[PDB]
Design a protein around this ligand. Sequence first.
Ligand SMILES: Nc1ncnc2c1ncn2[C@@H]1O[C@H](C[C@@H](N)CC[C@H](N)C(=O)O)[C@@H](O)[C@H]1O
Ligand SMILES: Cc1cc(C)c(S(=O)(=O)O)c(C)c1
Ligand SMILES: [Cl-]
Ligand SMILES: [Cl-]
Length: 235
Amino acid sequence: ATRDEKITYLRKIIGDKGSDAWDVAWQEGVTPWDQGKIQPPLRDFIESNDGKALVNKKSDNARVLVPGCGKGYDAAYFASLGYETLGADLSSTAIEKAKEFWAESPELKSGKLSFQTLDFFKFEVPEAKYDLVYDYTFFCALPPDLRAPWGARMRELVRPGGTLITLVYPIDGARSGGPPYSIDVQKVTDALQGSEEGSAEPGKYWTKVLDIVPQTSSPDHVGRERLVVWERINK
Ligand SMILES: Nc1ncnc2c1ncn2[C@@H]1O[C@H](C[C@@H](N)CC[C@H](N)C(=O)O)[C@@H](O)[C@H]1O
Ligand SMILES: Cc1cc(C)c(S(=O)(=O)O)c(C)c1
Ligand SMILES: [Cl-]
Ligand SMILES: [Cl-]
């Protein structure tokens, strides 16, 4: 079937089954988002001077979370940098296929990399929280009414002074419907900064330290993508 057809179906079964539709999609092989590798802006950020700084300052027990990790390319990448890394996905099928795709990873073998079937909204945040979290094609997978809970979870998941990286894609403008929902930095901002009763005036919970157009985007991502680095505050 075509990509449009696979997306049309995906949106059907989400309409009928809700969040259970994802493991169905994985079981049936309707995974049109799967690229087989990380997106280049992630590696370029990490190898950039800002990224080297972030990695060099990592504590000896620094922990990474990649929610909605799918086949887990991003989690495998962060583990290969020496971070103890958990890739979390709602679909047990996705998590099994991530264990297959990464079966030869030295970090999987050692346990430094770990894949687990987990609901991002429900699992128990560890006491130490996470030093670094990476969100790619997860915020844009969620229905719009789940964006505020996503930001609330994000605020609990990242330790004070820790970092959240959002590869914001797809920035398609006013197109309606999803997945993949058309998003932008403002939508990520509003979700992450939440509200303070009276208003949502930013600088409450995060500092947006970096917001760039990546220089190396996949060709179908050019013009629809921004990379954003957030630091958690209110220590
Ligand atoms: N509440 C949830 N908790 C954890 N994972 C979820 C949740 N809802 C949806 N997902 C997963 O989010 C993934 C969205 C995928 N389209 C993208 C996967 C991955 N980020 C990639 O770049 O390949 C799916 O694998 C879902 O199983
Ligand atoms: C969650 C989600 C779903 C889909 C179908 C896609 S994609 O087809 O555009 O690649 C992406 C990027 C994310
Ligand atoms: Cl990769
Ligand atoms: Cl934007």
